[PDB]
């Protein structure tokens, strides 16, 4: 199908020309609709050098609809739900939650790509913003007690490395 052909093509490109600090691909090539991504927090940001695994689950009509994405280890970020689900503009078409994200942020369409999703997630990790309320406690503590948020961010980084 076109979804499988498209996911196979994106995987080929990602393996040929990998983006910095990210490894991603199907957990097993007999099911290209379930990928695992490993993302490192960029230097000089809140979660710098942390290593964060996530699962991308693609819909049957990909690339017309975006995947769902979920971190599978602990996170504490205003835009990541407590169960790990990622809440960013690029993972939604212009029609769903049309105002729940920044007007400047790109929406899903077939010209987007897995590479563009993961780069957007990296930016989100670097630049937490408390105006998507996916994690209420994280958004409030980002707004009201950022020192405590920073302390937790550093613990999360250290645990993600086992140190």
């Amino acid at each position: 199908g076109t979804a499988l052909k498209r996911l196979m093509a994106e995987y080929k490109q990602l393996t040929l020309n990998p983006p910095e600090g990210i490894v991603a691909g199907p957990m097993n090539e007999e099911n290209f609709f379930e990928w695992e991504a490993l993302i490192m927090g960029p230097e000089d940001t809140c979660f710098e050098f942390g290593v964060f695994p996530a699962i991308l689950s693609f819909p049957l009509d990909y690339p017309l609809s975006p995947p769902k994405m979920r971190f599978t280890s602990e996170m504490f970020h205003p835009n990541i739900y407590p169960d790990g689900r990622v809440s960013i503009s690029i993972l939604h078409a212009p029609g769903d939650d049309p105002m729940g994200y920044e007007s400047s942020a790109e929406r899903w369409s077939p010209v987007q790509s897995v590479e563009k999703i993961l780069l957007s997630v990296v930016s989100m990790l670097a630049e937490p913003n408390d105006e998507s309320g996916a994690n209420v406690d994280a958004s409030k503590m980002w707004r009201d007690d950022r020192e405590q948020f920073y302390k937790i961010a550093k613990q999360i980084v250290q645990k993600s490395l086992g140190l």
Binding site: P18, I22, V23, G25, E29, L38, M40, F49, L161, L163
Partner: peptide
Amino acid sequence: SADERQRMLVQRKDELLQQARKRFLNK
């Protein structure tokens, strides 16, 4: 082949974690 691709993906994920540890400890 699918087999080699899959083992290479595992190797590269292991290596990403090892590199992150290096950079974290050198900072």
